[PDB]
Amino acid sequence: MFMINILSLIIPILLAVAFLTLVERKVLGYMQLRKGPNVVGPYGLLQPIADALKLFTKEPLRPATSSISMFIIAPILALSLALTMWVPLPMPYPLINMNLGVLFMLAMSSLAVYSILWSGWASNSKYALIGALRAVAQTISYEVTLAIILLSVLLMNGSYTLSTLITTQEHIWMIFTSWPLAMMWFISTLAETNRAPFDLTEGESELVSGFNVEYAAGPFAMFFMAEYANIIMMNAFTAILFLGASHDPHTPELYTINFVLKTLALTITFLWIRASYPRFRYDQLMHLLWKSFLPLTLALCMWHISLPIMTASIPPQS
Amino acid sequence: PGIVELPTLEDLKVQEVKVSSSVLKAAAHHYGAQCDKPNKEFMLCRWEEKDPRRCLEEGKLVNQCALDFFRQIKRHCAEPFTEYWTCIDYSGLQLFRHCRKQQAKFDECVLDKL
Amino acid sequence: MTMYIAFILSTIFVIGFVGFSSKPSPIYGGLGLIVSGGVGCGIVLNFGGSFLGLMVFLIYLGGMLVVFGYTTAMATEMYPEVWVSNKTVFGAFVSGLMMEFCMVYYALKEEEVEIIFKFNGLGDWVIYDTGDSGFFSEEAMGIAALYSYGTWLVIVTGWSLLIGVVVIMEITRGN
Amino acid sequence: MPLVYMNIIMAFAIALAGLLMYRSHLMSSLLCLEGMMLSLFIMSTLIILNTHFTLANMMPIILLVFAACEAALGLSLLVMVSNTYGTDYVQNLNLLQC
Amino acid sequence: AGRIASFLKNAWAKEPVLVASFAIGGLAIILPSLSPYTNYAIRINRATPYNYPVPLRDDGNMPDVPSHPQDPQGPSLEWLKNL
Amino acid sequence: MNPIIYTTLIMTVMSGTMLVMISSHWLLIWIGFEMNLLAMIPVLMKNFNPRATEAATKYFLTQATASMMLMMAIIINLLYSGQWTITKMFNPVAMTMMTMALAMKLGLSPFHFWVPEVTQGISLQAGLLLLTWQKLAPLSVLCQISQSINPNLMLTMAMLSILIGGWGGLNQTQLRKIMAYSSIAHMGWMTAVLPYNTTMTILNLLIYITMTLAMFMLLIHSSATTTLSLSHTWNKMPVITSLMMVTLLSMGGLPPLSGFMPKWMIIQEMTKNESIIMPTLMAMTALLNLYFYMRLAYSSSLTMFPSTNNMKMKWQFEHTKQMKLLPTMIVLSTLVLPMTPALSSLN
Amino acid sequence: MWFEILPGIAVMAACLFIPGMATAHIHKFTNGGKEKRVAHFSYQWNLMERDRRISGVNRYHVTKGLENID
Amino acid sequence: MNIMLTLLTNVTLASLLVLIAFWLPQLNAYSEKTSPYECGFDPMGSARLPFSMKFFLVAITFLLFDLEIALLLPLPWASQTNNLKTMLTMALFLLILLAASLAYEWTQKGLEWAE
Amino acid sequence: PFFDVQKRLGLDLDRWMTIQSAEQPHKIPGRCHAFEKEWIECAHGIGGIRAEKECKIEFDDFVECLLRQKTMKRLSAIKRQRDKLIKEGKYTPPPHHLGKEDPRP
Ligand SMILES: CCCCCCCCCCCCCCCCCC(=O)OC[C@H](COP(=O)([O-])OCC(O)COP(=O)([O-])OC[C@@H](COC(=O)CCCCCCCCCCCCCCCCC)OC(=O)CCCCCCCCCCCCCCCCC)OC(=O)CCCCCCCCCCCCCCCCC
Ligand SMILES: CCCCCCCCCCCCCCCCC[C@@H](O)O[C@H](CO[C@H](O)CCCCCCCCCCCCCCC)COP(=O)(O)OCC[N+](C)(C)C
Ligand SMILES: CCCCCCCCCCCCCCCCC[C@@H](O)O[C@H](CO[C@H](O)CCCCCCCCCCCCCCC)COP(=O)(O)OCC[N+](C)(C)C
Ligand SMILES: CCCCCCCC/C=C\CCCCCCCC(=O)O[C@H](COC(=O)CCCCCCC/C=C/CCCCCCCC)COP(=O)(O)OCCN
């Protein structure tokens, strides 16, 4: 019966990712004065299915100069970790209830980079290596700031339990308390998910395909699914963190609908941003994160440590 | 280095308090108010003797006093109490915050009944 | 003996140690240390130390990312070595696996003394506490007492980290 | 001592042995240093959790901190050596004799 | 009086992020030492009963110690509900 | 390197040593060793010159390995007794691991290989610090845990250090390697008496430190790091070579000089514990140190080597920066034997 | 159209509804319909185990009220 | 136990997808097809050659800064202590020295990539 | 060597963390608080040499609490005899050791 719950979490996530791709194409098209997919199915509703069936019936290629074990392990690790990040999210009840769910997401997101690193290295081609090294620089840029931002925000929660965040925001959204932290958190999520204007690893105009340039068919499809599931997952995490829906224990579906609407709004904002800005330079991303976000984040961390003691606002939990 | 002294299975016999956790939490405040003397005697024994074998008789009186307390609640208003702990039991964290109307009904019963 | 979960995890920990102790290509060595860090996190979780296991796993993920980046620059070695690519690396890996299995067998069905003391097995579940109380996590309170009891520890750790920044900047200056 | 303690101690011994028996790359030895730190962290955490020594729960974290300072030190040196030889091989460190 | 003003103007014109971060950090350092509520927080952290209050043995000359929880002796939390 | 940065690194090295010296908790002693090493590495690299990089890398690898074994011994001791206080080390495997880690840190044989290389690869000021200040923390730890120390292992390493320092010094023309082998021999002398009397260990350490400071300052004054470079000093500053000869004779252990006091004081102690063969072998082995000191004295002061023409120009200039503690150090390293009983003030 | 984007968003929203509602329904179904008990600390776990012991059927969710006091 | 089942399920699903991707379609692998990609022309050197890191000092610095989040992560629990004045002094002390570390690296040109 | 500045100044830099019986947060006790307290009290002020011989009973009990070696040996000797007695078949363990017990609150 817990297996049924695992499947009821996994399969709908994959369906949402498949249709997220259709949504991105349609939103970008209408923002570019065109229509996007509207032939394959009514309103392009069958386009993701055609894409998936096409990618899983095409020839997967193993490069001659590549290391096979890492080459094959990396997409598996990417997709499995993308699916694993969803299990502690309370919607309003989590599949897995963790004391330190935030730390769990931090650690698994840190482990997810090695899929790109090992993929790029094991492809044994120059563009894949350049993409992998860009991933190294990107993680170095965003990780410290993202962790300190999370700590500063959760000083209002009293713990790292994700369900407590619902109780914390019972009367007001936490974005009214820490919008300067929310802005930097949103930009750091853009960097962490390798999304434009921070999509350095793929580097399409610049590096052709970046890290997965040598990937074809099903393995490439798995990388794509992992990336889009990560987009949805990070936006759901932000929605839980900063825009807390009210939860009625006798009618949890109201919370579920509200939370899903907020997650969709944030994902559509991601797609909106991709159609508006040019790409960063990756050293410029490092300098943005280390010379602007880091000092402000340190100062705001001190402020959010002092404020509950200043005003006698310390949250309950031990 | 010696045999460990243990009580017999008969000395460990007592009338059990077989109510559930939500039932205990619904009555916890009044129970702590009413059965305080035997409870504190047993806890003083437990923390002074540092040995469960030396405070069995006080634990038996703790059980007996809890039985008397629950006997008074069932005898005077079981209905109001039952609606209060049932509402408390539904919560996954067993929250006092979510059942304030039922709690009021139970408190106002026990204020004039007892 | 129950589910052998802790023993399996410790065995995988040792196997990962053997993997990076073989001294093959660092990219591979880094992977073995990541496997060991995750499995050690699992071991610590199986004992009530959630925070410590998660923290060590996060720290080693970051450190191994830096090591991967450094390997691509300064330890590249055009034909990088996997465990089966060279007789020395394979020999060391097989020696480690065989030595671990020999120690486990000698300590499992019989009760041998290796260096310090002996072991009969019994599963690690035997040595637990039975303590029943608490609205907090004892591990969390112990770690949090660093800011009230460990004032001296905070002072020396912070000074060492600042000096570490200065020191790394001095070493790589060159000239 | 249970089997887990001996597995952790064996991990430390394997790492120490790995450190001592040099191959060619300097980075391969820095990895064995990191492994020794990881084994110490796990061992001390297990001992501390088992005996319920609450205050000692902060010492592995401290143990982690000075693990980074030692790694960052080593990598720093690995840079300079490489900048001299274009290679991190320990064979090149033979200018000084006994 | 006049040098610091020009320096602040130049810093606000060129690096507003650094000015904002330094101001926020300075406020975070200074304000807790000037607040009346900082004591209250401590008192709140002292009122949270994590462990069991073990009773004392009544030696017969312990006036301020209560004999029952509802007796008027002992610490009061009335200041907390009105806060 | 900036002078302020150099000053703060020196203060961090000293602070790590003092943290080891004032701690009762094993973790703080370990932290003191780590803090000492962290600030010690950049001091060895102050002048870049890739030999310094090599010496710093070798020193770091040796000291990090020793630190890891030290931490493992601490954890084993904690496992077999829930104790963090530095005491008699309830477990013998932990005691062996701790003794080996401290022997690696000090450079006792057979963990002695790194000392000559690191000393040759660094400058003379760095060598002075490495051979004087760096010995305080490990010896202060060994004094504390001396009661639980296994005599057979400690004395084996002490005899090996004396033999190896004496044999290694015979083959050296470079002055820094000579100093390193002298340091190894004196460490062996220090650790031979440690299980019997820690006051004798402290006395030997103090006399060795003053003698080493005098020798290193005399080598800094005359910028000589080789035997042939030192052989030119008679023709520029004869007084420096005369004081160097007397200091070398004292380091040899010849009576009535200051160097003799520790050996005389150690042998006597070992005879009160019914140890006769050990002091006799140690005293006879110290003659190798005396031989390669006498050879240096022959090269620099007791005969005159040929000089160069450009030395004439050096006759017109004076040593600009003066070392204020050099005269006191020379007098303390030579003329102090009549005040031997004052050693009772060390216990 | 721009409202032709809406069908895909509706499909995605329907897909994203399922996990939370399914978890809530499965929690109710396996927990007696009275919500899944949360045990962040050992005291809550002790309460759950006591409930399982006194339930007479080895289920923590079955609740024994004042009908067990004779 | 539930988390172990979840991890096993996710990894099994991903591996099954890889297996279907590699065993369902028709493979016609030949030497030209499997050759490395560099925009139509054969690569000059190896992709296993040293690739310089220009941000090497930031990467070493990230190691120390990453360990400071480990020291700051227990802060939510430390706010529950009675010695709030001591606790707040230590928390601010650690963040001030962290900022001072960044200030030293920034002013001494440590955050600039090598050319 | 050891310069006891903590004792001289009464500063307590690291003595709060040396033993497990020393003022834990929230009064959480160590697993062996009584044993270490008894061993420490018995050996206080008599010196290391005397304590090793005269407080060996307390220290042995403390070590038994720490590692529980004798307890595991006794349990193993119990279960080996039980296994032998069941393999040839004349024990028949009671129903409350197989899962057929009536649990108490
Ligand atoms: C049993 C009883 C007996 C016990 C015996 C104990 C042991 C006895 C001695 C053992 C052996 C000692 C060996 C010393 C080796 C030193 C190496 C060396 O300096 O090079 C040689 C040096 C070579 O000179 P050179 O090459 O011609 O000069 C060129 C420059 O090097 C070119 O460099 P530059 O251009 O960069 O020049 C910069 C220069 C110029 O200087 C400046 O411009 C000054 C600038 C000021 C900057 C301010 C920065 C402040 C910010 C940093 C804060 C750091 C905080 C660290 C603490 C963190 C704590 C967590 O600075 C220096 O040259 C070095 C500065 C030295 C600073 C000393 C720091 C002391 C720290 C104390 C730590 C303990 C604190 C308590 C800890 C508690 C636990 C936590 O000349 C000598 O030193 C000759 C030997 C001197 C030895 C002295 C004799 C022994 C002591 C006798 C006095 C009485 C002692 C007993 C006292 C009893 C208690 C009252
Ligand atoms: C969505 C995620 C879950 C999916 C759930 C379903 C899981 C599906 C399983 C994944 C594999 C998909 C592969 C589908 C095609 C079959 C490929 C292979 O298995 O068949 C052949 C297997 O046959 C082999 O030749 C060996 C046959 C016999 C030798 C050993 C088998 C012994 C079994 C005994 C069989 C006798 C009767 C048994 C009755 C039960 C191999 O042929 P090959 O050309 O290489 O591969 C390319 C396949 N093409 C042609 C379709 C492109
Ligand atoms: C004599 C030395 C003076 C000159 C030499 C300086 C060298 C030493 C460096 C700094 C010395 C400070 C260390 C003093 C030990 C701290 C512990 C003691 O003082 O009490 C603490 C007082 O700490 C306070 O926060 C004030 C001291 C903090 C000082 C701020 C840090 C500045 C250090 C800067 C020098 C260090 C190296 C350089 C780094 C920049 C906390 O006590 P409290 O919490 O009541 O009760 C604890 C007992 N409980 C838990 C059972 C209830
Ligand atoms: C009292 C509490 C203090 C601590 C709290 C602050 C927490 C963390 C904040 C600081 C984090 C680290 C800061 C790092 C400092 C950077 C130094 C630096 O390098 O500055 C130069 C620039 O110079 C500056 O330092 C900027 C101005 C000087 C500092 C900023 C202002 C200082 C304080 C201002 C606020 C004071 C309070 C506000 C008063 C309000 C008015 C009444 C950098 O620019 P470049 O990289 O060289 O640019 C090249 C491309 N063109």
UniProtKB/Swiss-Prot annotation, chain A:
Keywords linked to the UniProt accession: Electron transport, Membrane, Mitochondrion, Mitochondrion inner membrane, NAD, Respiratory chain, Translocase, Transmembrane, Transmembrane helix, Transport, Ubiquinone
EC number in record: 7.1.1.2
InterPro entries attached to this UniProt entry: NADH_UbQ_OxRdtase_su1/FPO, NADH_UbQ_OxRdtase_su1_CS
Domain of life, source organism: Eukaryota
Membrane-spanning parts: 2-22, 68-88, 100-120, 146-166, 171-191, 223-243, 253-273, 294-314
Annotated localization: Mitochondrion inner membrane
Topology with respect to the bilayer: Multi-pass membrane protein
Reaction it catalyzes: a ubiquinone + NADH + 5 H(+)(in) = a ubiquinol + NAD(+) + 4 H(+)(out)
Signal peptide annotation: none
Any single Gene Ontology cellular-component annotation: respiratory chain complex I
Cysteine disulfide partners in this protein: none
Presence of the UniProt keyword Iron-sulfur in the record: no
Listed GO MF terms: NADH dehydrogenase (ubiquinone) activity
Enzyme class, UniProt record, top EC level: translocase
Keyword 4Fe-4S in record: no
Pfam families: NADHdh
Database matches in PROSITE patterns: COMPLEX1_ND1_1, COMPLEX1_ND1_2
Gene Ontology biological process terms, A to Z: aerobic respiration; mitochondrial electron transport, NADH to ubiquinone; mitochondrial respiratory chain complex I assembly
Functional description taken from the UniProt entry: Core subunit of the mitochondrial membrane respiratory chain NADH dehydrogenase (Complex I) which catalyzes electron transfer from NADH through the respiratory chain, using ubiquinone as an electron acceptor. Essential for the catalytic activity and assembly of complex I.
Family, per entry: Belongs to the complex I subunit 1 family.
Record note on quaternary structure: Core subunit of respiratory chain NADH dehydrogenase (Complex I) which is composed of 45 different subunits.
Name of the molecule in the record: NADH-ubiquinone oxidoreductase chain 1
Provenance organism: Sus scrofa
Taxon lineage: Eukaryota, Metazoa, Chordata, Craniata, Vertebrata
From Swiss-Prot, chain C:
E.C. no: 7.1.1.2
Annotated transmembrane regions: 1-21, 25-45, 47-67, 88-108, 149-169
Xref: Pfam families: Oxidored_q3 (PF00499)
Record GO cellular component, one term: respiratory chain complex I
InterPro entries registered for this protein in UniProt: ComplexI_Subunit6 (IPR050269), NADH_UbQ/plastoQ_OxRdtase_su6 (IPR001457), Nuo/plastoQ_OxRdtase_6_NuoJ (IPR042106)
GO molecular function, one term: NADH dehydrogenase (ubiquinone) activity
Catalytic activity: a ubiquinone + NADH + 5 H(+)(in) = a ubiquinol + NAD(+) + 4 H(+)(out)
Topological type in the membrane: Multi-pass membrane protein
Assembly notes: Core subunit of respiratory chain NADH dehydrogenase (Complex I) which is composed of 45 different subunits.
Protein's job: Core subunit of the mitochondrial membrane respiratory chain NADH dehydrogenase (Complex I) which catalyzes electron transfer from NADH through the respiratory chain, using ubiquinone as an electron acceptor. Essential for the catalytic activity and assembly of complex I.
This protein's name: NADH-ubiquinone oxidoreductase chain 6
From Swiss-Prot, chain D:
Pfam families: Oxidored_q2
InterPro entries membership: NADH_UbQ_OxRdtase_chain4L/K, NUOK/Mnh_C1-like
A GO molecular-function descriptor: NADH dehydrogenase (ubiquinone) activity
The keyword NAD belongs to this UniProt entry's keyword annotation: yes
Catalytic activity, reaction form: a ubiquinone + NADH + 5 H(+)(in) = a ubiquinol + NAD(+) + 4 H(+)(out)
BP GO annotations: ATP synthesis coupled electron transport
TM segment ranges: 1-21, 29-49, 61-81
Family: Belongs to the complex I subunit 4L family.
Role of this protein: Core subunit of the mitochondrial membrane respiratory chain NADH dehydrogenase (Complex I) which catalyzes electron transfer from NADH through the respiratory chain, using ubiquinone as an electron acceptor. Part of the enzyme membrane arm which is embedded in the lipid bilayer and involved in proton translocation.
Name by which UniProt lists this protein: NADH-ubiquinone oxidoreductase chain 4L
Curated annotation (Swiss-Prot), chain F:
Leading EC class: translocase
Pfam families: NADH_dehy_S2_C, Proton_antipo_M
Principal subcellular localization: mitochondrion
A GO term from the CC aspect: mitochondrial inner membrane
Domain of life: Eukaryota
Transmembrane annotation, as ranges: 3-23, 25-45, 59-79, 89-109, 149-169, 178-198, 200-220, 237-257, 274-294, 325-345
Assigned EC number: 7.1.1.2
Catalysis performed (reactions): a ubiquinone + NADH + 5 H(+)(in) = a ubiquinol + NAD(+) + 4 H(+)(out)
Keywords: Electron transport, Membrane, Mitochondrion, Mitochondrion inner membrane, NAD, Respiratory chain, Translocase, Transmembrane, Transmembrane helix, Transport, Ubiquinone
Single GO molecular function: NADH dehydrogenase (ubiquinone) activity
Role of this protein: Core subunit of the mitochondrial membrane respiratory chain NADH dehydrogenase (Complex I) which catalyzes electron transfer from NADH through the respiratory chain, using ubiquinone as an electron acceptor. Essential for the catalytic activity and assembly of complex I.
Subunit field text: Core subunit of respiratory chain NADH dehydrogenase (Complex I) which is composed of 45 different subunits. Interacts with TMEM242.
Family designation: Belongs to the complex I subunit 2 family.
Protein name: NADH-ubiquinone oxidoreductase chain 2
